[PDB]
From a paper:
The apo form of Aae Hfq, refined to 1.49 Å resolution in space group P1, reveals a dodecamer comprised of two hexamers in a head-to-tail orientation. Initial Aae Hfq crystals were obtained with a crystallization reagent comprised of 0.1 M sodium cacodylate, 5%(w/v) PEG 8000, 40%(v/v) MPD; inclusion of the additive [Co(NH3)6]Cl3 at ∼10 mM in the final crystallization drop improved the specimen size and quality. These apo Aae Hfq crystals formed in space group P1, with unit-cell parameters a = 63.46, b = 66.06, c = 66.10 Å, α = 60.05, β = 83.94, γ = 77.17°. The tubes run along the crystallographic a axis, and their lateral packing yields near-sixfold symmetry along this direction; a slight translational shift of the dodecamers in adjacent unit cells, in the plane perpendicular to a, causes the rings to be slightly offset with respect to the lattice tubes (the tubes are not perfectly cylindrical, insofar as the sixfold axis of an individual Hfq ring is not coaxial with the principal axis of its parent tube). In the dodecamer, the distal face of one Hfq ring is exposed (termed the DE ring), while the other ring features a proximal-exposed face (the PE ring). Specifically, 3663 ± 244 Å2 of SASA is occluded between the PE and DE hexamers in the PE–DE complex. Of the 25 MPD molecules, 24 occupy sixfold-symmetric positions near the proximal face of Aae Hfq (the remaining MPD is near the distal face of the DE ring). The individual subunits of Aae Hfq are similar in structure, with a mean pairwise r.m.s.d. of less than ∼0.3 Å for all monomer backbone atoms.
The host factor Hfq, as the bacterial branch of the Sm family, is an RNA-binding protein involved in the post-transcriptional regulation of mRNA expression and turnover. Hfq facilitates pairing between small regulatory RNAs (sRNAs) and their corresponding mRNA targets by binding both RNAs and bringing them into close proximity. Hfq homologs self-assemble into homo-hexameric rings with at least two distinct surfaces that bind RNA. An Hfq homolog has been identified in the phylogenetically deep-branching thermophile Aquifex aeolicus (Aae), but little is known about the structure and function of Hfq from basal bacterial lineages such as the Aquificae.
Author numbering:
A (entry chain F), B (entry chain A): 1 to 72
C (entry chain E), E (entry chain D): 4 to 72
D (entry chain B): 3 to 72
F (entry chain C): 2 to 72
The structure:
């Protein structure tokens, strides 16, 4: 079909978001963030860990590892 | 459906700007900037801390953490 | 064709279920099989664990078997 | 409609006012000088006699040594 | 002609089968011959081992013989 | 004095035509040295004696000419 350049990334993020799965978000400098994905757009992800919000730039992420299996 | 590619990033930055909330801006090299968001555009953010202005390139940011909760 | 090599490499590793090492800019080495990929990301699987990898963080991908691309 | 409004105003004001700046790089190096020119991807810094072409992709922050009226 | 130099350099090294050193942003040095390339990746071969290299991770490519570009 | 467009192109082309030695500093602290033989949108070809080096611009932090450039 047509070009869908975000099909995997969008499905992964939306599934983690909708299922409220805790994720580890690893950054290029080795820092590991932890929380749930509250929202995301083209270039950013909003992580929530308790009462703390963190806006994460995707360009700084190496990997996202869910703490439960996602049925993507 | 509809997706807006900047809605999260713009709402986060604009709410912190309008509410004058102090933020920590973490950089790829581990440096942590602190201040208030005075302005922003597609690729840069203008931080203010006391009398000092800093132009930050978004490509160097890993995360932004607000010091108060943002109602987004 | 801007993606002819990259797409052929990733798809062959995916279809043949070949283990790969994915080396990152910071020296971390991931290991697993490529389950899926799109323009900017690759889904790795290692046993039960899934990992979404951003291509911008990858330096090299090394297959554990020879790929007939 | 104005994706560069802040970046251009900041760089152009520093350039026109000949304000000394610190340009911090991703690897921690701190350049110093005045902005002589800039384009989409680069900034030309002058520190006395020496010219340096800086790639914006390597910059983390620019800190002016005097307040910029922007 | 945004790729005139890059394409000529990579194609000449590929066609002449010249060994190259590919230096990465983190200081790792890969070695091999360029088997193929596209817009964003290079396929390096060192004997039996294939490595897909993302160009965004490369700092420099140094050929081990002079290329008549 | 201001090239809000074409600064990079003018700088690189002036160093190339004048055969000025440059230091090319990389993101990881490595300093390359040579003359710019050619360049395109994303790469620069450095020459240092008999050795050619293709440099990706995305890895460069700064380029410092060893003589003043009249851009
Ligand atoms: Cl898509």
């Amino acid at each position: 079909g047509s070009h869908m350049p975000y099909k995997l990334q969008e499905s992964f993020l939306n599934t983690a978001r909708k299922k409220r799965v805790k994720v580890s978000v690893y950054l290029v400098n080795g820092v590991r963030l932890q929380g749930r994905i509250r929202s995301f757009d083209l270039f950013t992800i909003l992580l929530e860990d308790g009462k703390q919000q963190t806006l994460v730039y995707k360009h700084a992420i190496t990997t996202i590892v869910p703490h439960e299996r996602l049925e993507i």
